[PDB]
Amino acid sequence: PAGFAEKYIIESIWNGRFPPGSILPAERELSELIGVTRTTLREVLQRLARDGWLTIQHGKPTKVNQFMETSGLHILDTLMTLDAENATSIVEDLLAARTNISPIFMRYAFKLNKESAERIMINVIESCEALVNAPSWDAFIAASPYAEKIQQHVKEDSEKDELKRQEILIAKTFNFYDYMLFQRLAFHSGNQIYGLIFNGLKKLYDRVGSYYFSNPQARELAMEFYRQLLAVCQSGEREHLPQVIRQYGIASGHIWNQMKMTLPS
Amino acid sequence: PAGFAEKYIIESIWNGRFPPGSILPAERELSELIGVTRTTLREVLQRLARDGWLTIQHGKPTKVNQFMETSGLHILDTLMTLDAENATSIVEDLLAARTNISPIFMRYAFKLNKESAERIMINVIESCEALVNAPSWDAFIAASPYAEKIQQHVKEDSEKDELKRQEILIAKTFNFYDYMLFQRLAFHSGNQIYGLIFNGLKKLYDRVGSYYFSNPQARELAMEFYRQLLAVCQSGEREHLPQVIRQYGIASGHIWNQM
């Protein structure tokens, strides 16, 4: 019940129903217009209090953090997801943004560092192949030249069931490579700001991707995407880059939506 | 001489000459490096340390901060001094990026929120028209419908010369409206993330823009730019948008380079 409250009013702060700077509903109140019990509602009003998006304490009651003015300290947090959480449009708007700016830093990458861009995309493709076609995550790790550092980024010690944990580990490794593709290409634009954006969001990226790429169909789609990214780069027809990235954004988004109606909770 | 040192070291923590991953060389062959007394090298090495990009110490080889992993700290903290140390291409990369994403979120704004967007640009344009065409900042502020709220953000008195104070006040005000243009349009894309980006850089924006818009020709250029944005939005011809913004980027970038 807490997770639902969590996500409801979080995404109500985002979509401006409980605007930044407003006083949040006193509480008697807020449990009908959330529609859940309040032992749980303020176990999550303190959860929510400050993971960094509400105010605490006694006499004057609770408003939401900031209007924003400027404290960029801890604004992404808690954080996120999957989307049993927020993501709302937050993660989906971030993803929309990734689709938005990707043709930019990738057009750059393909022009200034054709070189590297091809070297990276080829690397990523090769690795994802050895990942998804190994009969095990342990097999994959056994034959991978980069086993040790993968292990210093990829870990799972919250799932005991080996087969499930291994499915999860493969997902994490694939996200690892998706991130590699985007982050490296972004840094190979020549304008560092893009790469920095990816580095600052790497946690959020890691979790969301760990989730999104538990879907085989996602992994496949992504792998073909990486592929004609490479083809476009090699060919020089950087007029097809935004088509490719847009259609990818579309198909990936439709999968995102298919992991939504489906499945559990 | 101190600022030169500070910025040199900054702007190649930037390009990786001492990449985020390096241990910084001993200080004397740094005075072989590019020629300031280093009595004060250590004053600016610690200067950068304080401001958050080098770490100082016990016995050491003093190495510079994390290398990135986050802390995203507030590494705007803010040796965005203004950007004399430096616009490196940090500010210019931000500017290039601004140019980069502007046609996108402005295309969104003009599509989903045509009338509101038009309204924002008409606002900004009218305010700036009344701005540069007034015989003084004092006149402008006297007849301005938004005086109290301009004054709540635009203020400057560390300058004694009344007339110069009036020029810098004009500059700060024009920057105020430029920011309004970009930030409002970005928040009117429909994806709040853009607007938040501008909000997160608003300090840096405000400075860089204050100085940049201390130039009359900059202000003029900006105003015709705003106008062509408006015309493009009104026409429905959202295909001229990356064109227009590109031209702005070029001309402004040229002015930015000191012309």
Ligand SMILES: CCCCCCCC/C=C\CCCCCCCC(=O)SCCNC(=O)CCNC(=O)[C@H](O)C(C)(C)COP(=O)(O)OP(=O)(O)OC[C@H]1O[C@@H](n2cnc3c(N)ncnc32)[C@H](O)[C@@H]1OP(=O)(O)O
């Ligand atoms: C909206 C989001 C919110 C965020 C805020 C945004 C708003 C404003 C934005 C920002 C604020 C503005 C104000 C702040 C400004 C502050 C600036 C600064 O502080 S300084 C910046 C410098 N930043 C750097 O990153 C430089 C360093 N550059 C790099 O590191 C390169 O990019 C690099 C190395 C990552 C890419 O180079 P490669 O293409 O050659 O990649 P390879 O080096 O070969 O691989 C690295 C590792 O990966 C392994 N690897 C390679 N292939 C692999 C494979 N197939 N599988 C697994 N591992 C593999 C290798 O074994 C290797 O290991 P082994 O590095 O030695 O530990």
Ligand SMILES: CCCCCCCC/C=C\CCCCCCCC(=O)SCCNC(=O)CCNC(=O)[C@H](O)C(C)(C)COP(=O)(O)OP(=O)(O)OC[C@H]1O[C@@H](n2cnc3c(N)ncnc32)[C@H](O)[C@@H]1OP(=O)(O)O
């Ligand atoms: C600056 C900050 C950058 C942030 C990025 C950092 C990275 C993220 C970091 C942390 C998050 C964690 C992520 C980890 C990732 C690993 C796991 C995954 O890969 S999950 C991927 C699953 N797929 C999705 O989630 C779909 C994302 N959404 C999209 O890709 C797009 O929204 C898409 C393709 C679904 C289309 O949505 P539409 O709203 O943008 O476009 P429409 O509604 O269909 O068409 C209407 C208008 O769109 C405009 N439009 C489209 N593109 C435009 C553009 N580039 N510029 C301006 N306007 C554009 C056009 O004006 C068009 O209107 P007219 O054609 O005139 O009628």
Ligand SMILES: CCCCCCCC/C=C\CCCCCCCC(=O)SCCNC(=O)CCNC(=O)[C@H](O)C(C)(C)COP(=O)(O)OP(=O)(O)OC[C@H]1O[C@@H](n2cnc3c(N)ncnc32)[C@H](O)[C@@H]1OP(=O)(O)O
């Ligand atoms: C390192 C860099 C950091 C970057 C950060 C990374 C990016 C993203 C990364 C990770 C995501 C993490 C996500 C967590 C975030 C935590 C919080 C949240 O979840 S979101 C909270 C913010 N949300 C909003 O701000 C909603 C959008 N904001 C607005 O819309 C503005 O507040 C608003 C309403 C002011 C602008 O929209 P209008 O078009 O409606 O403008 P009007 O309502 O007319 O307000 C104009 C004001 O200016 C005056 N004004 C109007 N015309 C004027 C004129 N011509 N001259 C001067 N003043 C004028 C008006 O009189 C008025 O003043 P008067 O304060 O209301 O009294």
Ligand SMILES: CCCCCCCC/C=C\CCCCCCCC(=O)SCCNC(=O)CCNC(=O)[C@H](O)C(C)(C)COP(=O)(O)OP(=O)(O)OC[C@H]1O[C@@H](n2cnc3c(N)ncnc32)[C@H](O)[C@@H]1OP(=O)(O)O
């Ligand atoms: C996601 C992060 C978002 C962050 C956003 C941050 C926002 C701001 C926040 C905080 C910062 C504070 C900001 C305060 C702002 C307030 C005050 C102001 O307004 S200051 C305004 C000063 N303006 C600049 O500094 C210009 C910025 N730079 C640019 O806009 C670009 O660099 C630009 C447009 C100047 C150049 O862009 P290109 O890289 O696309 O152009 P090329 O690289 O030179 O090449 C283009 C192609 O076209 C040809 N070409 C170039 N020039 C040509 C010509 N004149 N004729 C024909 N062909 C040409 C070239 O040969 C080249 O060919 P081939 O594609 O390589 O094959």
